[PDB]
Amino acid sequence: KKVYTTPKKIRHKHKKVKLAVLNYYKVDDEGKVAKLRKECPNCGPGIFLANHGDRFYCGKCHSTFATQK
Amino acid sequence: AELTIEDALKVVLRTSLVHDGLARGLRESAKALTRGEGQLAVLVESVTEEAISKLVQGLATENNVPLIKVADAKQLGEWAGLGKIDRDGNARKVVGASVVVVKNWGADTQEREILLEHFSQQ
Ligand SMILES: [Mg+2]
Ligand SMILES: [Zn+2]
């Protein structure tokens, strides 16, 4: 057979940078809750917006926002 | 001793697990609480920093209160079945169940309902 080419640069699947008990949401009083950012208009509450410099999206609908918030 | 020692929550949890209607974990629980899904709420007592528990409480408050004490979480998890096979009997690797919320229920009536009622009406 013919020899393999060998440029060098390999690309692996990203490990994702997992993070839980994320700093979204808050509570001040104790009794009631204070939501941070916002929930989805398309789907029901529980899902939360992605916040960037005048650009939003959500993951349950893979990524489908446009309007600011 | 024929009377149940808070063993009409564990049973419910088991049932939920069997029929696949358990929001285990915190985010999931929160989600359940938010929409027409989360019917019974199950928060850990021994929480470091008190924060998760507080959150759970808040969630419960927000619209309809479905909360209960919970006996250390680990026990609950064990009851549910957190572990594959685990030899012939028992011998499951211990896991903290964390926050749990019930969807679906499945099974009807029995002592669980009574317990819920008791918790509610004051
Ligand atoms: Mg080739
Ligand atoms: Zn969405």
Test A46 with B59 for CB contact under 8 angstroms.
Answer: no
All residues of chain A having their beta carbon less than 8 Å from the beta carbon of residue B59 are 33
Q: Which of 2.60.120.10, 3.90.550.10, 2.60.40.10, 3.30.1330.30 is the CATH number of B1-122?
A: 3.30.1330.30
Distance in Å, CA A58 to ligand 2 centroid: 4
Nearest by CB to B31, which of A20, A31, A46?
A46
| Data resolution in angstroms | 3.8
The CATH number for A16's domain is: 6.20.50.150
Show the domain range for A4: 1-69
Q: Where are the alpha helices (DSSP H) in chain B?
A: 10-19, 26-34, 51-62, 74-80, 110-120
Choosing among A21, A26, A35, A58, which should be mutated to test the B contact, i.e. which has the most B CBs within 10 A? A21
> 3-class DSSP state for residue B101?
strand
State the burial class of residue B44 (Cβ atoms within 10 Å of its Cβ: 0-12, 13-18, 19+): buried
Among B101, B106, B53, B75, residue whose Cα is nearest residue B7: B75
Retrieve residue A12's tokens: 């692996």
Count structural domains, chain A.
1
Distance in Å, CA A50 to ligand 2 centroid: 10
Among B6, B31, B10, residue whose Cα is nearest residue B118: B6
